[PDB]
Design a protein around this ligand. Structure first.
Ligand SMILES: [Cl-]
Ligand SMILES: [Cl-]
Ligand SMILES: [Cl-]
Ligand SMILES: [Cl-]
Ligand SMILES: [Cl-]
Ligand code: NA
Ligand code: NA
Ligand code: NA
Ligand SMILES: [Ru+3]
Ligand SMILES: [Ru+3]
Lengths: 130, 130
């Protein structure tokens, strides 16, 4: 599913993302926008370590979800990676939270570092009433 | 699916394309028309570099989507090029938004520049009530 901007913000806010471990709703919006285009079906293979990023947050098969294809893997979210390719994003929300409870926080995602960090991101929630 | 002209103008307008990065609805229409004749199933293989342009916007598998058969690929929309052949263009629109956020914007499609840039394109939207 391709969420609409304000529809995703309200969905993420309903599930407690706004302010989570310090992270504003807008920064989650920005991450998802550059990771997937708000598309729960996005995917991206990584040839360096033969892992794959899954879903609306591009969560990686090495450390966070099991896809049965990735060497040296752990399943820190205890999820089939295919659970992160589903129209319902409750599971993906739970796994993004689990990712950011580690020390480096939202810095886990490179694209967030390059596209969102230290940048104005109000554009993501302006006019959504959240 | 081959869109009818206004059908596509309403669809693209509903998916937020009017004014996106300053790109008019009319210009997106002119891009779709010269890329694929509004045909969601259009594909163009290039035996030169073995890449393929997909769907209604003819997005290329070397830079933007993964079709698992193009050398030197980077999948910047984190998307299967199959998603660019759907009747539902929601994945395609989201990927086209990612394309024009690069520094060249819409100028990425050489056809748009040969056929649309600096030209009158009001005829693509008028009568469509958009
Ligand atoms: Cl990750
Ligand atoms: Cl392209
Ligand atoms: Cl990139
Ligand atoms: Cl002329
Ligand atoms: Cl009119
Ligand atoms: Na891929
Ligand atoms: Na879920
Ligand atoms: Na994208
Ligand atoms: Ru940095
Ligand atoms: Ru507001």
């Amino acid at each position: 599913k391709v969420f609409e901007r304000c529809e995703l913000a309200r969905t993420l806010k309903r599930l407690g993302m706004d302010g989570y471990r310090g992270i504003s709703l807008a920064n989650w919006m920005c991450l998802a926008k550059w990771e997937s285009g708000y598309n729960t079906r996005a995917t991206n293979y990584n040839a360096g370590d033969r892992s794959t990023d899954y879903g609306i947050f591009q969560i990686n098969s090495r450390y966070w979800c099991n896809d049965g294809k990735t060497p040296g893997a752990v399943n820190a979210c205890h999820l089939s990676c295919s659970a992160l390719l589903q129209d319902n994003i409750a599971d993906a929300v739970a796994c993004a939270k689990r990712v950011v409870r580690d020390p480096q926080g939202i810095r886990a995602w490179v694209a967030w570092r390059n596209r969102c960090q230290n940048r104005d991101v109000r554009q993501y929630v302006q006019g959504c009433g959240v």
